[PDB]
Write a protein that binds this DNA or RNA. Sequence first.
RNA 1: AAAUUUUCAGCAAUGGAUGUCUUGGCUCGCGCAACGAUGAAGGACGCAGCGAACUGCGAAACGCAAUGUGAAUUGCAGAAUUCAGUGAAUCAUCAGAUUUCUGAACGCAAAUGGCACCUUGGGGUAUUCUCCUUGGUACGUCUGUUUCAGUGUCUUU
RNA 2: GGAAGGUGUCCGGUGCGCUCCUGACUGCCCUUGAAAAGAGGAGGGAAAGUUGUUAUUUACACCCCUGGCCGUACCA
RNA 3: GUGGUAGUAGCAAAUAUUCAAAUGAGAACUUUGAAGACUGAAGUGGAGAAGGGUUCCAUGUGAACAGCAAUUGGACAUGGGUUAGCCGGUCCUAAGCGACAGCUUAACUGCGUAUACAGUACCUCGUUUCGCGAAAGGGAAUCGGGUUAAUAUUCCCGAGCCAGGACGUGGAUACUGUACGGUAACGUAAGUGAACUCCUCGACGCAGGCAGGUGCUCCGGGAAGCGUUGUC
RNA 4: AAAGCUAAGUACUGGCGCGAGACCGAUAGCAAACAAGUACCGUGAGGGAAAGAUGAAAAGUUCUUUGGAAAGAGAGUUAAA
RNA 5: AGACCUGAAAUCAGGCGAGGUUACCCGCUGAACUUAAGCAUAUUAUUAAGCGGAGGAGAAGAAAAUAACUAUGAUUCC
Lengths: 55, 49, 121, 87
Amino acid sequence: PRSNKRQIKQAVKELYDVDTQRVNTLIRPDGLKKAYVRLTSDYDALDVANKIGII
Amino acid sequence: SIKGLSLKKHLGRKQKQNRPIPPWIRMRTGSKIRYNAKRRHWRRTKLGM
Amino acid sequence: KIRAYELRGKSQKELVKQLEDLKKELAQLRVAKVTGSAASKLSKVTEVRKGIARVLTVYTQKQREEARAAFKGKKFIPNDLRAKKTRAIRRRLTASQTRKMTVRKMKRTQNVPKRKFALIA
Amino acid sequence: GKAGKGTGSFGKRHGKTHFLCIRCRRAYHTQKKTCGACGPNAKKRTYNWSEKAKRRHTTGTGRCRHLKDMPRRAKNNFREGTKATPV
RNA sequence: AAAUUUUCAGCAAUGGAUGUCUUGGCUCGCGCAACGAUGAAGGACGCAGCGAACUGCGAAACGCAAUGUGAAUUGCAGAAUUCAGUGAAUCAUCAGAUUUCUGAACGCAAAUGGCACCUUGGGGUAUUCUCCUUGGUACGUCUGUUUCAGUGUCUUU
RNA sequence: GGAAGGUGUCCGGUGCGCUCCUGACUGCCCUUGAAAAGAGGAGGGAAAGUUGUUAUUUACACCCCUGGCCGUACCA
RNA sequence: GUGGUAGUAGCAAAUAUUCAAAUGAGAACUUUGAAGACUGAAGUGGAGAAGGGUUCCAUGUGAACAGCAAUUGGACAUGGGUUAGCCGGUCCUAAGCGACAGCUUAACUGCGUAUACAGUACCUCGUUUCGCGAAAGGGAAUCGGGUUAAUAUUCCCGAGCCAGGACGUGGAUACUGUACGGUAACGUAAGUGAACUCCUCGACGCAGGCAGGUGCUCCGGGAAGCGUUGUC
RNA sequence: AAAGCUAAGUACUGGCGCGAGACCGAUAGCAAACAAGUACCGUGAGGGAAAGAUGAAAAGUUCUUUGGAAAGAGAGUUAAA
RNA sequence: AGACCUGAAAUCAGGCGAGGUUACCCGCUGAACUUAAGCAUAUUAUUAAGCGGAGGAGAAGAAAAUAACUAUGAUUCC
């Protein structure tokens, strides 16, 4: 929840090796940031979600 | 509503303290615990925080 | 499987690589907690996050041994290492200063020494 | 007459004099900017006319992170920069 | 004579007295001297494989290192290796580390993760640009240092 | 069919009407009806520029890059 | 802790329900249809603030709670949900309020506008002290359609705008010194302007009628579908 | 006199760690024998409870039967329900 | 031009202060209920509350002292 929208862009680039179009960001009631991250039109999400195993 | 982030977290915490105690806890040895004492209903009793 | 005596062998390059290796395995466990698993898997998180904390300990332990090796017997030691104790204990004067006397009170102490005397039966 | 003395006037009241203080509770007077219990002042507000008030908020009631470890520490005369020996 | 009301006993109900317990209180005595700008007490928010609280702890988060003891922990799960051992434990001990946001609380603030500047190291037409990143910048006061101001008292180039 | 394909979406009035807005007026006061951030104009003429890698144009036209932090459910 | 009072007082404002079928152990009370009513746009409607804090949404249910009932629920349990350069806070100052210099008091407090606060090196200027104080005052910029069980000027599709900073190609203007035109009011694709100074906007009362405009309401023709039809 | 230092015996409802008792025995003893300065009330200063005991061992009543279910009835565990 | 004197600045170099605890201890400040069978001086009391400061103890302390004796001999406590 302390994280920045520019950090998430660069951290997602470091982990999964995928470039980001547009991060949106939202603090749940909990006290947890949820980041919605639209990927660039070059890449696909269902390639990346299978690579991680969010599927 | 138009709250600060501080007040959001105080609210946030007191959702998470408002749930029934785990079932397995009573089963464990030497415990007199029965149902959570501090449970609160949002109408009945109020926070101010 | 990690033990802390084995990590005191390994280098300041090597410790870093291992620390990174564990954090990958800790991340790929969080994914499995979210999606689908059994309780056979979710015990392995406890091993590895204690593994991480060992490697931070050992790294920081070597960091401080080289500092204390270098600043040994020298003034102006860094504040990071500097012997905490209490606040009051830190204050005071050295035993030498409290103990030290004037040139006057030296002469009265010196010339009248402590004599072993006794009384006869 | 419906602004009232009781029920009508109790309808009107939706203010907040007090909000949480950072140091103390919900004493922090928002207009006045001071706390009923903690008291902006460097010194902590406490009074001998209430002994139960002192009782609630003194050393040991909280965590005591620095202090709990003290008896053990002073028992050994504050030994520093050493280890236990292997036999 | 039923029924009802009242009384006495038996059985059942309701209720928690009496009795017996007691890891708690109370009182007396005897020792010891150890909080804090090297960030205290107190506060807030987090952390467990499956926890709300209470205890514990601080992104190293019911803990890590070291030492001792030497085989558990336990409600369930799993781990079985950890089993003539460089080693089990919600164990003891504790001399080494971590120690978020706060608070005397210290860049300005504050029902705001608000608003600055300097600084380290790196990332993207630029010395002035934006970005991530490291650590700073409160007040009083002592000794020393450097740079000054005063037709203060003096010589004088 | 058991979601695929079509046409049409046109042309005029009316008002002390109701609503909010603008505009210029008229009156009222022993009542004359906030400030600052910020944006721009003008007076001034400091600077630069010698027929080409110059120099003024960064809102002349087009083109290029970046936009952090927190609130955001629901009752009222 | 427990009686008598006592299965008593009582559950009577806000016009009102009824019939069928489905669900279920069970229906005066849940849902769906058909009828019949009420609210009657200064609404019991559609949106915000204060205050509340997960009540929101879905699936499930043994109690208790919802002064009858209950298959229902703001109850109980397990999950899920709040996406912004342009909507606000953030920035400015108002009434006021904290601190600086100092001044009081044993301090606690109380007062607080007093002060030495651009062209490595060389000059020349220099009167205001820092901050807090408006989610209705001031203020950079956003609109259409679609979308989810629960979010939308925030997601998606499309069309734009603003603040800060900028490469490039192609045009203007000047090169003894910053464009021209019109009598003028002023004009056009562009059309340099430091220090310092003055000015404008920001920037403002109430009542009255009058004129014009948005939206609403209204009348008529055309094209679609719908309703009524023993009678017109 | 108008300047100054100085241990001991002495004090000690706090902190820290021991040892006792012609004391109290859950309406007592601290407010608190338990998740007690807790639940909860108050805008706030503050206020402030109730709540100990199955059994040696959970062996905490599977199984047949009625019922929508809760429970009942058989049977069963235990020295005893 | 150079000796001083006085006063500033600095995120200069290295240090020290602040706040917490209440049983005992040091200093200020300072009531009334109450008693007097009324009440005002007196009493409660040089107490409670308030505002400062400590330590393992604190304060006190080696006579500008008692005495008037055949004289004593810091301080504290019994």
